[PDB]
Symmetry: D2
Subunit: 455 residues, 4 copies
């Protein structure tokens, strides 16, 4: 079953519908790197679900009531009581987006030499942990590393790995547990409530803190409602509130599940840490009552978080992504499984098995997808992994994928069909996809501006 959109269209965004021949010229002018395409040349932009969401009429009404005061804005108090109501944490500090909150948390909660352990990681999150002296430890269940394995709650932490870390390093040497919902690196996989409670139980017995990386916590809550036994009579809001009852705080990117184009925040329960967070936010972000956001954006984020609690909205959000994954799977196209909350990942290693990883199959597949459909997708393979600048060799990731990342409330099932139909057509003559080589490679951040040409 795939539900209809539980909303109608209030206003549209113009696009140009340039045809295939012209798309090829734009792809060549971008050096076959979709990160270099101009937004104005793109019909369906699946580069990311971050900050690309469509807001509602109610959010846009809030955008006209921005109280732009430097301190004490009504919009901050609205955001504050909304997050306190829906997440249940005592204190909240706004930040301009998620990595601003991570900066603060890692400076507040880490002593050099300590460990942070998590269910895999995200690049900014782990950077701020390591920048502040922590050693990262993956404690996700082994199954999460098998990208073909179709099992539920693949994001769950292996409690035995957590126990082993505690035994070998000592509780006083673990800064905190970083529990992400959902788990990005595994393809957007959810964590069960049973797992969040077991982790809270174990850590609490040793005095260890747990902070959630909560950026897709609403997609996560929908998976719990759909698939965890006993939650079929619970509302999304009830599930979200219980999830965070097992954390000491969180970092949140409103740009994902709060349905906004900018915004984030930091939550915590501890008064002392809250006091310290207020001393630090002024350094990097702004006042404890705006945190690097315009008043109108704290307002849009307060309204959007509350909209995200509607069951039909998040059911349709997740099932629209599933529709795309299901259609590709039915045609035999290789994808990471199960499909996650926010994106479908094509397995470009298998899609282009006539190409070596040194010929950048994910990068080339993403270029072909744009030329054939006007769809932009993100390379998430060897190019994005970067190069070891000590040795000069590529970092070679096991996952060589193209990410079809779906913004919330922007596209329809007919756009999903455009995407799927083009990919399926490509797959039917996949052996024609050509390898790529660098013709310009910057020293750092190479996925952003590198240019290629066909081998």
């Amino acid at each position: 079953n795939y539900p209809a959109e539980p909303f109608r269209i209030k206003s549209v965004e113009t696009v140009s519908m340039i045809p295939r021949d012209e798309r090829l010229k734009k792809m060549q002018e971008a050096g076959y790197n979709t990160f270099l395409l101009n937004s104005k040349d793109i019909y369906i932009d699946l580069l990311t679900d971050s900050g690309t969401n469509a807001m509602s009429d109610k959010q846009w009404a809030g955008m006209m009531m921005g109280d732009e005061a430097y301190a004490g804005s009504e919009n901050f108090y609205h955001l504050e009581r909304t997050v306190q109501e829906l997440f249940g944490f005592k204190h909240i500090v706004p930040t301009h987006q998620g990595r601003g909150a991570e900066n603060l948390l890692s400076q507040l909660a880490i002593k050099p030499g300590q460990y942070v352990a998590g269910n895999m990681y995200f690049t900014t999150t782990r950077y701020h942990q390591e920048k502040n002296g922590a050693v990262f430890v993956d404690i996700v269940r082994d199954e999460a590393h098998d990208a073909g394995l179709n099992i539920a709650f693949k994001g769950d932490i292996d409690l035995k790995k957590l126990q082993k870390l505690i035994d070998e390093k000592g509780a006083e040497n673990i800064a905190y547990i970083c529990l992400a919902v959902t788990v990005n690196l595994a393809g957007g996989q959810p964590v069960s409530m049973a797992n969040m409670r077991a982790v809270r139980e174990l850590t609490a017995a040793h005095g260890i803190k747990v902070f959630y990386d909560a950026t897709r916590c609403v997609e996560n809550a929908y998976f719990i409602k759909e698939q965890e036994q006993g939650f079929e009579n619970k509302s999304i809001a009830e599930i979200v509130h219980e999830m965070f009852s097992y954390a000491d705080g969180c970092t949140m990117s409103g740009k994902k599940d709060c349905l906004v184009n900018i915004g984030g925040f930091l939550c915590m329960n501890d008064d002392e840490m809250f006091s310290s967070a207020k001393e630090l936010v002024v350094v990097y972000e702004g006042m404890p009552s705006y945190g690097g956001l315009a008043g109108r954006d704290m307002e849009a984020m307060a309204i959007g978080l509350r909209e995200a609690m509607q069951y039909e909205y998040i059911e349709h959000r997740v099932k629209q992504v599933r529709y795309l994954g299901d259609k590709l799977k039915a045609a035999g196209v290789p994808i990471v499984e199960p499909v996650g909350g926010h994106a479908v990942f094509l397995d470009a290693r298998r899609f282009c098995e006539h190409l070596t990883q040194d010929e950048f199959p994910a990068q080339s597949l993403a270029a072909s997808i744009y030329v054939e459909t006007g769809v932009r997708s993100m390379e998430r393979g060897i190019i994005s992994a970067g190069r070891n600048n000590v040795t000069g060799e590529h970092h070679r990731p096991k996952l060589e994928t193209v990410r079809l990342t779906i913004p919330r409330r922007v596209y329809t099932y007919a756009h999903m069909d455009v995407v799927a139909d083009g990919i399926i057509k490509l797959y039917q003559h996949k052996e024609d996809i050509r390898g790529l080589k660098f013709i310009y490679e910057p020293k750092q951040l190479r996925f952003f501006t590198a240019r290629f040409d066909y081998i």
Copy 2:
């Protein structure tokens, strides 16, 4: 066959359905007239494509640059030159919507006792004609009155009927020819360029004026591009400009094909009529420099008329309607054919063969659709046709229909599937729909607020 939306969703609004028990209460509280239901109590609102359209980001940017000056507004100058460029008429008078422009035309162009001849009637148009003393003559071809007959360009005027009217009544007794594009009450049926040419040549030879109802002229232009030999490679804008070259002026409801929520205008080439038009607009609408519109709405209408010329936009608009009709026809649901530009018309005579037209089956079917589905649709049969102003009897149209009217850029194919799947289910107990009778009948335009009860 069915293209995806040639735009993205920029902002949304929520939709909801109240339980069947509650819809039943709402429907009897509205006296079984869909026009009397409240917006909140509706899930997918197909009452009309008039004024319900979704605007684009460019239009909303224009809405922030409303120049609200009483005379000399930049927005007026933009609307004026846009209409002069795209329609080719010498002079433009804005009005707050289409029936304001009809009020002006009918007062300017009709001497009492004269005839006005058009391709089928429309409710407000015919009222303003008769209120100023004209007799309406229907000169559409006979086929346009038979719902099931699938022929192209059903909106065309019968040149033999036009010729007969001239011979029997004399050209000086004909105030003007009223040529509507598309023809709404025939089901949204288009008029060919050949027919517009032939009507221009015959009327010009007798000195008779021709005024167009331009309200859905862009839908009409699409049908010409798609189906009239020789126009396959002309742009929508070129087709529109050539259409109006066969006319002396037009009335326009911008609330339809100009993609706005309010607005209309009157165009003419004649200098003396324009002078008279400016005198009269002041009485009813406003100064000729804004015509009962805010500046920002003149701007939105100027921008939207030009957006409507985009081929992919209007192809998708029309094919989305066609999709709904195709799905209903594939299931045996009786509809007006061919599907028109803006709506699917269910054939109430066949949905409700157990009822005579004096039991108002179209009014009754629209009520039942709301109760079982929460979808709102409009009566388009004997109730809308009004009464003969000489005999006091119902006008008795052969087309007794219920209109599923599609606002532009608001809904998706998934919403069309919800509508279609629901009507297909109602079709399978069509015998349950009861006949209706008046308990309150207005003295004119009675369909708007009439109240009925079951027989």
Copy 3:
């Protein structure tokens, strides 16, 4: 005393600040007719207070929540309950602006041959009365015709004139009393509560209806609060509610005191007339639940009417106009007295006493004002009176004025100083102002497009 603005600026409208030499070229290109100037060439636009108001952040939030449904819009229900609460009438029909409501009222309430009597008149209001067969009778107090006489509540109806009309024509032959608040033709003069009650008392004894032309009823209520003994402890809302308790209905232009750029409505208490109004509004305006307005505009007008009830807003509105009048009066510049609620009228006959009325002193003064300051003002003298087309002679009004009409919440006291300082400078060498002659004069609506040159 002159209060500070009881609001701050949320957003600004760009203007060009072209200098004097360039303003002279624009005035010449406009044929020395300020009605022909382009809005983009004007610094301070005092042509009219109609539809030119600045909205609040709350209104603009409402503009993002337009429910554009054809029937049953939430925005209509908001407008409806707001007007019922604040004005106290039983029924309300929206119209696109005031003259739409006048059209409806005059068709509903007049039998040909009857009289309508009022405290002077407004052009659209009287047109719709006469178009429907009424003979207009001025029953304003004689003082209102003395433009130099500085007395309170100059808009009051002479009860003895009303009594005389009843005695001479008979009550059954009077369609209604049209009581305007404030009185435009006398310069914006208020009516006392004592007068509204005496008129209600007298008419009610004869079964005669009273309908208010309520377009500046809030300015009127402020004058009652400031100057009528016994109302110093009443809120503006309490005064407004009591005012309308003495009418059977009203016509309202939201474009004036409801702080919007478009919108109006018709109110009445009688069920039968309400039913008849709903039958007629569909003819000219739209549905009883939108009346020729987008949903967002019914919303903005509902919010704005309520904002207009704030005492500090309307005190500042009226006292900003008074500031302008007081400053001019102190320099000896001749104005209509007392200054009204919405505009200052310069007496161009006295300002330019070296010019005959046939040399259009008001028209010329308005041209000089624009050249010296970038301020546009309206000619309200012989040109606007038009020409007797039977005899060819000018209509020669006693008042030969330039109207400095002040939009609500748009300008500051420093803009008022620009206006006053420029006029005072002109007055100090008033003998240099040259007479004007026609070089193009249209047959009708001559103030709108006539062009002049210096004698």
Copy 4:
């Protein structure tokens, strides 16, 4: 002397004052720190000109055309080319506001142990310098530290101090010169073009880099046009472009002179520094293609920076501030002189001569202003100066001031009169203001959330 607003009011927001009894409660609940008061409880909010500006209609039209794409946004390209055109720097990295750009510059450009030398300190700037290991050296001329001394271009660097620092420490030990325009904590004092030239020539001869704090560069350009010989006929844009020609890069808070509510950026000419800057921005702000800003805010900032170049706009901006200072000085109120570009600084040492600086008279005066007036103002003295990081004692600035900071395009001269009239009244019982002491002191940037109590 004082020009009127070179714009009209497009939309408003309401202002209100709570009773003195309630302001007293609010002030003690905020621990006598103005930063802790709530926006709703303030009547005229002069806490800061940062992020509080009113945007124009053109900017708000841009806000409807946010291109929210992660890379390649039209809004990014517009901001980039606007800054390249107007400032002349080769490369731009957007940041969410100014201290994000300072974070990046200080990490890129400082080796631990090096010196950074600037024209007076600023709070966040100096924190990022010292946090990355630099020692701050103040090389402004001595006069900038004496509040009462009325001399032009008080912001100028003392070239003798710069020369001395080079000789005593060696150019390789100076990380860069930090030249701020205007100089905020000297009272908004401008820097001359001659001084920017001379600093460029001396630093270039030793290979020392110069980075500007551009936050109020347009105010600065106005002072140059008004007061520096030879610039009287140069445009504001020409002056701005020449200023930045003497710099190697800049940090910008667009929240000041770019007329927006959020936004900033980092500019530089060096290719390698730009590459490093892009690596680092990802960690803290976002991708280099949006830098922690929504697309619509990049657009608003591109539009606003160009609006700021309008002469009449910035003349009025500065002269409105000057008006407030002139009125206060005419009454004997002690202020920093000359009045700067963005604010009037009351001299707390003279308003509160009965207090020593250890009793925090500036913090105390800001509290009392709120209680007696409801106007919010900011502490700018010993509390903001922080503590010496080697000795632990207060930094002891000669300037102990309370800032009346004027947001751009928000208030009127009538609002300035309200502020001035209120401060003049407080001046006449200045002896009543009590001394303060810390009850809560943050470890850095303590002024933001410090809590005090009366001594």
